[model samples]
Target: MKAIAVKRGEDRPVVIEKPRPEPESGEALVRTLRVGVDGTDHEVIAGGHGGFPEGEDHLVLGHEAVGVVVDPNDTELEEGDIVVPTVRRPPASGTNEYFERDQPDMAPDGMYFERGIVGAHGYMSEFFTSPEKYLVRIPRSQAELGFLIEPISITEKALEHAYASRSAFDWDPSSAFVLGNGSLGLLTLAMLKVDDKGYENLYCLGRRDRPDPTIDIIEELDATYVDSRQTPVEDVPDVYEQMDFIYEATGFPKHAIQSVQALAPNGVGALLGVPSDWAFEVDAGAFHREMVLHNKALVGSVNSHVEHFEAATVTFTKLPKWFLEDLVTGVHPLSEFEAAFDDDDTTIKTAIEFSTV
Candidate 1:
């Protein structure tokens, strides 16, 4: 089998030969069809996370894979079924089960970039083996949308975090400010539009207007777009006069602080972006004042669970065709793995189409 792998830190990802994996008990061998790429992959490729287990050997570099089952053993899955495999798996028992049942973290033992962050084999290949229980079945009618489930699930995690946080108070649908206009940011907005908590004003704060097609989609979805370059960041506090909710999807540390400054009294700011490795400086007095005076809440979330992933499956089904298709900007053949990361800004959602090669 041919898989995409990195030789070392910041090294170009190369297609290399490896033995095809077979299904074991409680597992399934899947023929890869599609694999999504994003900043996460880029970060891993750059050897940013030191926790991976790949060691000196090249590890596989894909997680967002849509595939058909080739072999299903000791599981209920069938041959020819199209499914999205979980990036990580829950532990088979113990505190792991408690976390899986009650918390949203991926099961402790589940697959991640931990060992294979750089030097190990990843899903950017023709086929890979994944735990049977980790696979989410997709209806045949929606098979083409298979590659998108992972990204959709990521946004779902943010919404779930927000919903859980807001459940305590009067559910307000008046307005929200999403900080960022990237793919994840736009997806977050899209999820908010369909959320049960309706909103009359959904604002998107971007650094600048680049005439990007995705920006057009953000507006098309009825979200009010704001180019922060022209508008003062401090003005957010006065513009909405205590906006009901704020979602920080930019993952930029400074933007996070700005998000806090713009939040309404008693408003909630759900931090959804992954911050780069750096110490963040926050105004403790301002933070305290916002919390004490306004009862402001700042919450954060990372990866999600199968439950959230399942909810996203429903959202993707309900998404309009144009939105779904337009949201996906790049699709490369598996053999061209390095190209996916060559120009990050050009793609909103890039994926590897395995069958193409």
Candidate 2:
């Protein structure tokens, strides 16, 4: 089996041959089809994020993957079923209710091991094994787009938390804002459009102006695109109207701060970005008064569980085929990993195809 791996503290990934994994009891063997490459993957390779599995010199470098079940061992899944595996596993103690209830995304740090990103081998190899409980089946018709479920699942959990936080009130949010236009941002916008707690107006904020696919996608979905370079996120309420919901996905620390100030009364902001150490001045007195008076809520979210992965699969099926396809700017065989990682201004998503290799 061929695997893409990176050593701890190394700055590049390499293709290496490895023995194929066999399924254990209650697990299934899956043959890799495609793996989506995102900032996290690059961060791992650059030695800026992620860790190698304990005692292992190298860690396989993929988490957003779609694969076909090659062997089903004592599971309900069929041999040919296409599936996406959830990334995190609870620690050996297994005491957290989050994992016990299929909500590992809510687990505290150091309580879980994320496949490919933390202390476990990932699914970057040609074949890997996972318990059936961790696998979410995708319809055969949408198998080609299955790699997207993982990232979409992240938004699923975020939105779920945002709504859950409003349980104390009768919240009827009409206008929503997404504070980025990258893959995660765009996908978050798409989900907002389809959410049952509907929004009357949808806005996407990005640095780019019009004549871009990100802007096009926003318009096609009947949503407006705001160029932050011209009208900053803080100016959203003045330019359009007070947003009832705001989702921040840019990973820019400042955007999270700006989002708090931009929220309307009783508005909920979901922060999905992960930022490094940075310092900025804020009007703590004013910000505290606004939150206290308006009853606004802000929630930070990451990683998704199996249930969120299942929800994302349904969301993908509801989306237009062309819209989903447009997000994937490049698809390369594993041998051409360099080409897949080539930076492009217009690139939204790039994937590596293990089947081709």
Candidate 3:
């Protein structure tokens, strides 16, 4: 079976081969259908982000994926069930307290293995096997868009973090801002409006110009789009308004810092961006004073679990049809994989379609 792997020090993906996987007693064999490409995949290829499996020179590179059950292998899942696999799995050693408690995402570094992004092989292959418990089913009719479920789960977990913090008080936030305008950002922008989030003032920040497709999509959603070059995140409060909720998805290391400054009193922000280490500067004393006085909250989040994926499927179904069509700019076959990884201006979201489901 063919798989896409990123070489140890190369900045491009290459096709490789591995034997077809057969399911174990509690696992199911899932044939690849589609895998979404994102910035993390690029970082992995460049050897700046994820790591290779132990004793392996390369890593299979697709975590945002959806597939079909080819063989149930005594699992509860049935053949033909379309499902999206969760990224985090028990470490190479096996389950710990985190996975045992259904909170693998809560595990600290060394306790868990993130598929595709860490020490375990991922789902960007002709076929991959996953334990039945980690696969979440979606409707077959939505199979083409099923690969998006993983990204949506990312936002779902972010929102859960934001709301959970506000649950202790009578906080009813009316406005929210998303800190990026890529495909993930645009999806979160739509999710803010479509999903009864109750944010009358929905905003997104990007550095694009007019006649931009993402700006158009943001406006069509009836949300405001801010050009970061003109009104940076730190100045959002002075130019527009202090946001009640903020979601940071930009790997720009400064966005999370700026989000705290732009947040309204009692507002909370979820930081979802995975950035490489590069230290510049920050006003620690002043920032601490502001946080202590204003009662601001910023939560750091990364991967999502099965519960979040289930919630994401609900959010995924509510996304506008036109929005989905506009967001997915390219869906290519394995032979034309480069097009799917291209970050040209015309490209928004790209996916590799392994087979027609």
Among all candidates shown, the one with the greatest lDDT: 3
Across 1-357, the per-residue lDDT of candidate 3 in tens digits comes to: 999988776778889988998878899999899999987878777777778889998888899998999899989898899999999988788889989988888898888888889898888899999888899998888788898999998888888887888888888889999989888899999899976658888999989878889888999999999999999888889999999999888888889787888989999989988886867688887667767898888898888989888888788778899999999999999999878889876789999999977
What does candidate 2's lDDT look like per residue over 1-357, in tens digits? 888888756667788888988788999999999988887777777766767777888998889999999899899999899989999887756658887777777788788988888888888789999988999998877677678999999988888898999998899999999988888888788788888888889999988755777888889888998988888877778988888999987788888888767899999999987676789897788678878899999998889887788788788877776778777888888878767676566888888888831
Candidate order (TM-score)? 3, 2, 1
**29-57: candidate 1 lDDT, tens digit per residue:** 88888887766677677766433442455
Best by TM-score: 3
CA deviation > 4 Å runs, candidate 1 = 90-121, 278-282
What do the candidate models score in CA lDDT, each in turn? 0.71, 0.84, 0.87
TM for every model, in the order presented, reads: 0.88, 0.94, 0.97
Indicate the worst ten consecutive residues by lDDT in candidate 3. Answer: 283-292
**For candidate 3, what is the TM-score?**
0.97
Off by over 4 Å in 3: none
Evaluation by lDDT, superior candidate among 2 and 3: 3
Colliding pairs, model 3: none
Give me the displacement of residue 182 in model 1, in angstroms. Answer: 1.9
Better of 1 and 3 by lDDT: 3
